[PDB]
Amino acid sequence: GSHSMRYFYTSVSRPGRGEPRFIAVGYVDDTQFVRFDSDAASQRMEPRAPWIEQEGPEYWDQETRNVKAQSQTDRVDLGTLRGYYNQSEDGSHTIQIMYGCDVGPDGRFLRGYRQDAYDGKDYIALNEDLRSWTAADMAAQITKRKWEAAHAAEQQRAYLEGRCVEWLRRYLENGKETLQRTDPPKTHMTHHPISDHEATLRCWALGFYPAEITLTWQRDGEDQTQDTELVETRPAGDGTFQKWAAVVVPSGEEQRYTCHVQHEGLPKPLTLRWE
């Protein structure tokens, strides 16, 4: 299928408790592979996946040098955006950054993106042509002009079309035996009586990768959404993911309901009925 490399930065100011915290994580699809924590002992980029551990020492200190530079500019950006919004220096504030690049099964560039945030709200985002920006408020429009004058959109695009797409390919072949695996969901259904009149059917999906999955409930062949509960897809901790979808039905009518499971590892969708 198609794959994506994504990095997630977080910078949280803590006034009077030292310089702001900085956490960087890198993902290939739903597989984390690198980490950086300013509060950690290493102070370096660290591997979080086996297939990245085979990179030479020149890879790690350059990835440390660049990610430390980002964290240092994230720190000054926190003091600058504080001024844009006329905020007190006693308050704690958060800068979040996400960027990445997508490739197809043929290895061709598909897409690039970058979006920044302040205190959980949009701040500035790279446009789809990778040559323009969109500011979320008048504070971000000052940054937008600073980045237009600095030609920041072309620095980001040279990376998204350049080493991002290429190193994503390199990661995809070195970790091929786990990154390109397809773990189909292992499915089963449970039944718990609610009352003398109603029961709950729960459709389970376990041990699947990647995390994208659609779990459908159908009565009489029609989709059901009332009396439904669907939990957020959750990580199992071993690299796989879990999810379930429940529905409460009149007792005795359990058999009119069908659960549908679609996933990448399933060429044919799975269908579950109570029997």
Partner: peptide, 10 residues
């Protein structure tokens, strides 16, 4: 690998 540069500050 991570991106570098991209501006001179916000």
């Amino acid at each position: 690998v991570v991106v570098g540069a991209v501006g001179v500050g916000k």
